[PDB]
Structure formats: structure tokens, C-alpha cells
């Protein structure tokens, strides 16, 4: 490790863990090094070769094959009492929370581009057999030069299945009403809820629900000017009955999702 990567300062230590900035010696590639104690890992899994690792590592490996809108796992290590994860690091970079906080609600054209990229990245995960379970602004990075959104933190993920989930260790204010009322949910439909929350956030500059009475209420009030169509989609994604929510297909053929800008154009138009 220490001769191959050189550890720099500390990036964050919110939900993901203790993540530091690194530079890989061989080619000066920017990376992010995440450490995790073994004592604090609540959730284990096995690799293809049947090694016992953190689920995070398991899920990361599955999604890291191929180019996608997901930060890729490049390497990883086991130590006596921790595991170390080497990850991509865009530069310059900023998460979607800070972006929104600095700049207010995003214009619709921008939100569309971003939201699409999120959608696309999430479909990738599902195709790969992985359910993120913690989709939110804090877990989305923006390469500010390329206009590319990347998805992060598989610390609450799970293998994607078509049966019910009884556990959930994600974000409460992003969690759907089926979890609030019944501590039961299915992956995709839950995932769609969070994208409704996410979309709202982008266009309103804030999440729509603070409390549970609000969540299970299923009334969206818009604090900002949002087009009639974008509201329609948001309200659809946040439909109380899981079965009444759209599918990823249905979302991306929604009128509001049409004529998306390229990532590059988005950068030129909204980031430079
Ligand atoms: O997010 C920033 N830099 C970063 N670059 N790459 C990261 C990967 C991760 C990361 C952490 C856990 C995981 O399962 C997958 C990816 C976190 C942060 C990363 C910051 C604050 C501006």
C-alpha cells in the first residue's frame, strides 16, 4: 500500500466513512482512499472467489466493470482491524448538496441533465444486481469540467432482489412510506421514491418532507416555480402506493425527460 499510493488530506467523513485524498504513484492518478473498521461493519458478503469482505466491497466490484455514472473501485486491502478501499476521484469535484446549497434550486434544463445521469447510473446498478438504497444529493458527485454525475457510498446497499426488504439503514427523510408504516419495501419502487425526493430537491433547493406525518401524507407543496410537467413526474415518483409509481422506463419516456443536454453541453452551459 504505502509505496503504491500516497495518502494526502482528508476529504469527508460523513456517511461514507473516513475518506482521504490519494495519488497513485505509478501514474499520478487521483484516488480516494476509504478506510472502515471491522468492528463497525454491520453487513458482510462474499466475493466471486468466495472471500469474506464488506458488502460495500462486494457491491462495488459488481458495478465497477465498465464505464458508468458510478465511482469505480480500483483496488482494496485487508488490514488486521480494517479494510481499505481505493476509489476514483474526479478533480475538480463537488457533491450535489454543496452545489445546490451554493447555487439555489437548479434550473430545469440542468436538473434534467443531472437527474438523467442519476437515472442512468442507477439502472446500471440494477442491471449489475446491486441496489444502492441511499440515493441522495450527498451521495452524488459532480465532475465540474466534464458535467458528469457519479454515484457514491455503497455502505447501505444490498443485492438486488424481487422480494421484500425488511431492513433499511439509509436516510430516513429519503425513505418511502411503505417503510415508515410497515418496515417492508421492494427495491426498485423504493429507489424510485428517493429519485422523486431527489428531483424535488434539485428543482426546489430542499427536500419535500421533514417528518413522517408529511411522508405518509403524500402531499407535495412546491416552494419554487416548477413547470406543470416536472411537478407531474415528481408527484408520480412520490405516489403513496408503490405499485402506482413509475418504472425507470416510464420515467425516461415522461415528457419532462425529453431533449436532454449532453454532459459536455451541460458543463459549458451551466458549470463554466
Ligand atoms: O466526494 C468527494 N471525493 C471523492 N472522490 N471519490 C470518492 C469516492 C467515495 C466513495 C466512498 C464509499 C463508496 O462505497 C464509494 C465511493 C467518496 C468520496 C469520494 C468529495 C467531497 C468532495
Q: What are phi and psi of 23, to 5 degrees?
A: -135, 125
- Domains identified in the chain and CATH numbers: 1-91 (3.30.200.20), 92-272 (1.10.510.10)
84: Cβ below 6 Å to ligand 1?
Answer: no
Which atom of ligand 1 is closest in space to residue 60's alpha carbon? Answer: 14
Q: Which of 196, 247, 248, 202 is nearest to 218 (CA)?
A: 196
Residue pointed to by grid coordinates 405516489: 239
Catalytic residue among 39, 134, 137, 244: 134
- 213 C-alpha vs ligand 1 centroid, how far in Å? 33
Which atom of ligand 1 is closest in space to residue 11's alpha carbon? Answer: 21
Name beta bridge partners: 94. 142
Which atom of ligand 1 is closest in space to residue 12's alpha carbon? Answer: 21
Active site residue 81: no
- State the binding site for ATP: 11-19, 34, 88, 95
106: Cβ below 6 Å to ligand 1?
Answer: no
List the resolution, Å: 3.0
Task: Look at strands 73-78 and 29-37 and give their pairing.
Answer: unpaired
* Three-state DSSP string of the chain: CCCCEEEEEEEECCCCCEEEEEEECCCCEEEEEEEEECCCCCCEEECCCCCEEEHHHHHHHHHHCCCCCECCEEEEEECCCEEEEEEECCCCEEEHHHHHHHHCCCCHHHHHHHHHHHHHHHHHHHHHCEECCCCCHHHEEEECCCCEEEECCCCCCEECCCCCECCCCCCHHHCCHHHHHHCCECHHHHHHHHHHHHHHHHHHCCCCCCCHHHHHHCCCCCCCCCCHHHHHHHHHHCCCCHHHCCCHHHHHCCHHHCCCCCHHHHHHHHHC
Amino acid at each position: 500500500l504505502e509505496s503504491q499510493y500516497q495518502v494526502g488530506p482528508l476529504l469527508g467523513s460523513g456517511g461514507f466513512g473516513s475518506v482521504y485524498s490519494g495519488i497513485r504513484v505509478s501514474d499520478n492518478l487521483p484516488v480516494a482512499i476509504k478506510h472502515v473498521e471491522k468492528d463497525r461493519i454491520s453487513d458482510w458478503g462474499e466475493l466471486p472467489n468466495g472471500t469474506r469482505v464488506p458488502m460495500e466491497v462486494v457491491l462495488l466490484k459488481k458495478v465497477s466493470s465498465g464505464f458508468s455514472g458510478v465511482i469505480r473501485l480500483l483496488d482494496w486491502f485487508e488490514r488486521p482491524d480494517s479494510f481499505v478501499l481505493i476509489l476514483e476521484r474526479p478533480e475538480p469535484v463537488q457533491d450535489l448538496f454543496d452545489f445546490i446549497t451554493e447555487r439555489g434550486a437548479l434550473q430545469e434544463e440542468l436538473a434534467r441533465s443531472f437527474f438523467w445521469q442519476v437515472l442512468e447510473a442507477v439502472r446500471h446498478c440494477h442491471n449489475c444486481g446491486v441496489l444502492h438504497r441511499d440515493i441522495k444529493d450527498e451521495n452524488i458527485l459532480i465532475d465540474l469540467n466534464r458535467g458528469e454525475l457519479k454515484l457514491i457510498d455503497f455502505g447501505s446497499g444490498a443485492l438486488l432482489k424481487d422480494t421484500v426488504y425488511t431492513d433499511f439503514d439509509g436516510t430516513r427523510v429519503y425513505s418511502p412510506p411503505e417503510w415508515i408504516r410497515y418496515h417492508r419495501y421492494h427495491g426498485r419502487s423504493a429507489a424510485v421514491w428517493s429519485l422523486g425526493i431527489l428531483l424535488y430537491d434539485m428543482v426546489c433547493g430542499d427536500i419535500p418532507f421533514e417528518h413522517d406525518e408529511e411522508i405518509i401524507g403524500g402531499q407535495v407543496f412546491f416552494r419554487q416555480r416548477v413547470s406543470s410537467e416536472c411537478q407531474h413526474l415528481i408527484r408520480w415518483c412520490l405516489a403513496l402506493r408503490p405499485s402506482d409509481r413509475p418504472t425507470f422506463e416510464e420515467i425516461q419516456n415522461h415528457p419532462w425527460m425529453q431533449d436532454v443536454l449532453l454532459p459536455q453541453e451541460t458543463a459549458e452551459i451551466h458549470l463554466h
